[PDB]
Ligand binder design. Structure first.
Ligand SMILES: [Cl-]
Ligand SMILES: [Cl-]
Ligand SMILES: [Cl-]
Ligand SMILES: [Cl-]
Ligand SMILES: [Cl-]
Ligand SMILES: [Cl-]
Ligand SMILES: [Cl-]
Ligand SMILES: [Cl-]
Ligand SMILES: [Cl-]
Ligand SMILES: [Cl-]
Ligand SMILES: [Cl-]
Ligand SMILES: [Cl-]
Ligand SMILES: [Cl-]
Ligand SMILES: [Cl-]
Ligand SMILES: [Cl-]
Ligand SMILES: [Cl-]
Ligand SMILES: [Cl-]
Ligand SMILES: [Cl-]
Ligand SMILES: [Cl-]
Ligand SMILES: [Cl-]
Ligand SMILES: [Cl-]
Ligand SMILES: [Cl-]
Ligand SMILES: [Cl-]
Ligand SMILES: [Cl-]
Ligand SMILES: [Cl-]
Ligand SMILES: [Cl-]
Ligand SMILES: [Cl-]
Ligand SMILES: [Cl-]
Ligand SMILES: [Cl-]
Ligand SMILES: [Cl-]
Ligand SMILES: [Cl-]
Ligand SMILES: [Cl-]
Ligand SMILES: [Cl-]
Ligand SMILES: [Cl-]
Ligand SMILES: [Cl-]
Ligand SMILES: [Cl-]
Ligand SMILES: [Cl-]
Ligand SMILES: [Cl-]
Ligand SMILES: [Cl-]
Ligand SMILES: [Cl-]
Ligand SMILES: [Fe+3]
Ligand SMILES: [Fe+3]
Ligand SMILES: [Fe+3]
Ligand SMILES: [Fe+3]
Lengths: 169, 169, 169, 169
């Protein structure tokens, strides 16, 4: 084993490689959305900026897991990143709904990893998940939920969507 | 009696303890409204901020009466604070209407205390009420009335409510 | 359910509404103590300031739980806030002893909530409790214990109480 | 009558000349106390400073009434200022007790003047009394009451008096 490895179970190592792929995929989905909202026939720059920042944040999350794998003496194994589920994302509301569902899927995967880490008595990994992943995930879900409610109030199409988009820019 | 007490009638002392409870109750109502407007399915941050500031102001009013009781040599007697009348406050307009009615109930109680103080020839207490309570109460009632009119013009629901909420934030 | 709710058990939601009431009650107790120490026949401004800050901190704790309830998609339910157990709090030492006992009761309730959250496999809630509640609670208990010892050394009445009160101001 | 006089009753004018004498007398009492506390066999510089400031404040109050008399078109009539009741004022506590009683006598006289002004329907004079006299009088009485309680806790003689005197300096 690595000279640094201690109390680090192979199942946790493998699941971290899964989380890395998942968050690179989420980053790719959000990148797709970001540029979809910059099409000349869409032109929602607030939504575009929101999704570009979300894309960057998911990539940073994946990188934090890569750094963590090395810190514990595990070995990063990178897999193909699937194409985004869609090429076109519909209305602003539909993109936010897709984002909410994706964030809740990532949250479920992170909670499953926390359960794996807890079952293997790895408190360093449970702490990482609590502090660096689960908190930001809940905050993101609440933010997107709020956004959905606000956009449904404002619009969710036509002038209300135009005005809501300005709040994100 | 207290070594400081002078020209301070027991009925005024008791009524001040009533005003303290009333304004703590009003503070609690506004706290409830503040967090109602931060629910993910409500998401009106301007209304939330308006009610959080109103909650703080009512608590400060109660504290000023507690300080006043001690200044005159009366004795603070604290009672249970009732649960807010509602757990959910409806639309922004409905919450403002509830706030207007509550402010006018508090104003009526303060005017009754002023009449009690005047009838007991307590000019220190009539001055307190005029300067520290009755003025702010009338200003609050006018502000809320204005807000109701503006929100009815803008909306009072859908895009107009979304836009009005931004004026409060 | 709320569009944001995920891995949030009804028993945790209900217990959070309990913690909110408990900490609003504790805030009210400390507010009572604060103004008791500003009576003209008590006149302990250091104790008054200590309890006014404690009152503010407990209210902030309650508000953090209200925000948390909304973040997770639970629903805030506010109940009556009981009158403080006493209207007059005795000596400075007696008030500190009452505060120590109250802080340990709140700590026990928070530890019970942590056990509920752990049993329901809610690591977001266990992290909240550890970071935002249990640490400050232990620090408050140690501070009050220290204060009790110092006041017993200095006094706990007469000149020693007068001098100790200056250390808190 | 004076070219400025309007709605100014002779009884109010005469009572103001009384208040002027009373507050010059109170100023003289406090001046006596101030220098009593600077005797080499007393040597309480905090008490001395407290009474010198009190003396100045009472003289300023008298001067505000002199200015007021002229503002309304009344005529200042100055009388002899009696010698202070004592030449030696005893302990710090005894001087504070004498000050409390004097402040409450002045307060009673001011409240009687307010009743005279109210009965003569002079709202300019009732406002003067409320804003420039009755408020400061109640605050002074509460401060002295607090001081008495603190000094009784600390001492009121020997080391506690020595230490309390430092809080006033
Ligand atoms: Cl290796
Ligand atoms: Cl290992
Ligand atoms: Cl292993
Ligand atoms: Cl292991
Ligand atoms: Cl597509
Ligand atoms: Cl839509
Ligand atoms: Cl897993
Ligand atoms: Cl919709
Ligand atoms: Cl559209
Ligand atoms: Cl349409
Ligand atoms: Cl009493
Ligand atoms: Cl009285
Ligand atoms: Cl009475
Ligand atoms: Cl009376
Ligand atoms: Cl309800
Ligand atoms: Cl409505
Ligand atoms: Cl009344
Ligand atoms: Cl309407
Ligand atoms: Cl709406
Ligand atoms: Cl409609
Ligand atoms: Cl709900
Ligand atoms: Cl759930
Ligand atoms: Cl459940
Ligand atoms: Cl659950
Ligand atoms: Cl009691
Ligand atoms: Cl004691
Ligand atoms: Cl529990
Ligand atoms: Cl003891
Ligand atoms: Cl004592
Ligand atoms: Cl003793
Ligand atoms: Cl003349
Ligand atoms: Cl006249
Ligand atoms: Cl006349
Ligand atoms: Cl007249
Ligand atoms: Cl003498
Ligand atoms: Cl004495
Ligand atoms: Cl008179
Ligand atoms: Cl004594
Ligand atoms: Cl002595
Ligand atoms: Cl002795
Ligand atoms: Fe992520
Ligand atoms: Fe109020
Ligand atoms: Fe707490
Ligand atoms: Fe005066």
């Amino acid at each position: 084993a690595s000279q640094v490895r201690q109390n680090y179970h192979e199942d946790c190592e493998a699941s971290i490689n899964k989380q890395i792929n998942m968050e690179l995929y989420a980053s790719y989905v959000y990148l797709s959305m970001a540029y979809y909202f910059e099409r000349d026939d869409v032109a929602l720059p607030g939504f575009a900026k929101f999704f570009k920042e979300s894309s960057d944040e998911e990539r940073e999350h994946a990188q934090t897991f890569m750094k963590y794998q090395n810190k514990r003496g595990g070995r990063i194994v990178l897999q193909q990143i699937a194409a985004p589920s869609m090429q076109e994302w519909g209305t602003g509301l539909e993109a936010l709904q897709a984002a909410l569902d994706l964030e809740k899927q990532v949250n479920q995967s992170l909670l499953e990893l926390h359960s794996t880490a807890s079952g293997n008595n790895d408190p360093h990994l449970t702490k990482l998940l609590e502090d660096e992943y689960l908190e930001e995930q809940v905050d993101s879900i609440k933010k997107i939920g709020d956004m959905i409610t606000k956009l449904k109030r404002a619009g969710p199409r036509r002038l209300g969507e135009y005005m809501f988009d300005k709040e994100l820019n």
